Design a protein around this ligand. Structure first.
Ligand SMILES: Cc1cn([C@H]2C[C@H](OP(=O)(O)O)[C@@H](COP(=O)(O)O)O2)c(=O)[nH]c1=O
Ligand SMILES: [Ca+2]
Length: 129
């Protein structure tokens, strides 16, 4: 897998961000994770976490997996990095997302995220509290 440059246009919620990628705007949906919706418990905290992570970053990168790069709603599917730190993994490690939507062929970072979920759960963090 390879990291590609992109720039934040706007944070949207816990697991979706609008980025400029190859000079076109697109909504990216974070691979392998599921945050609460804004109206649900921890929804606002997941949104605020992803917003601060993305907005604070000097450099945002997108990393596609081996499989489909857009979903059925035309959203990009990627691992997103903020100054080298994976947002997907970070949300999970904080108990602000569950591992979810694991489809064959786009699952390269599954065990890494599962490892992070295990530790958030062990710590009784947020969603796991
Ligand atoms: C994360 C991800 C979501 N999706 C689709 C599955 C779900 O379809 P359905 O909308 O029919 O339930 C939806 C969940 O996205 P959200 O969690 O953003 O709502 O997005 C993919 O198809 N591939 C993916 O990798
Ligand atoms: Ca969601």
């Amino acid at each position: 897998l390879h990291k590609e440059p992109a720039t934040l246009i706007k944070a949207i919620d816990g697991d979706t961000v609008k980025l400029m990628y190859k000079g076109q705007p697109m909504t990216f949906r974070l691979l392998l994770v599921d945050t609460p919706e804004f109206n649900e418990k921890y929804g606002p905290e997941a949104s605020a976490f992803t917003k601060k992570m993305a907005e604070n970053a000097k450099k945002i990168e997108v990393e596609f997996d081996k499989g489909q790069r857009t979903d059925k709603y035309g959203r990009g599917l990627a691992y997103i990095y903020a100054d080298g730190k994976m947002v997907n993994e970070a949300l999970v490690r904080q108990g602000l997302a569950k591992v979810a939507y694991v489809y064959k062929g786009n699952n390269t970072h599954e065990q890494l995220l599962r490892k992070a979920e295990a530790q958030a759960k062990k710590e009784k963090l947020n969603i796991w509290s």
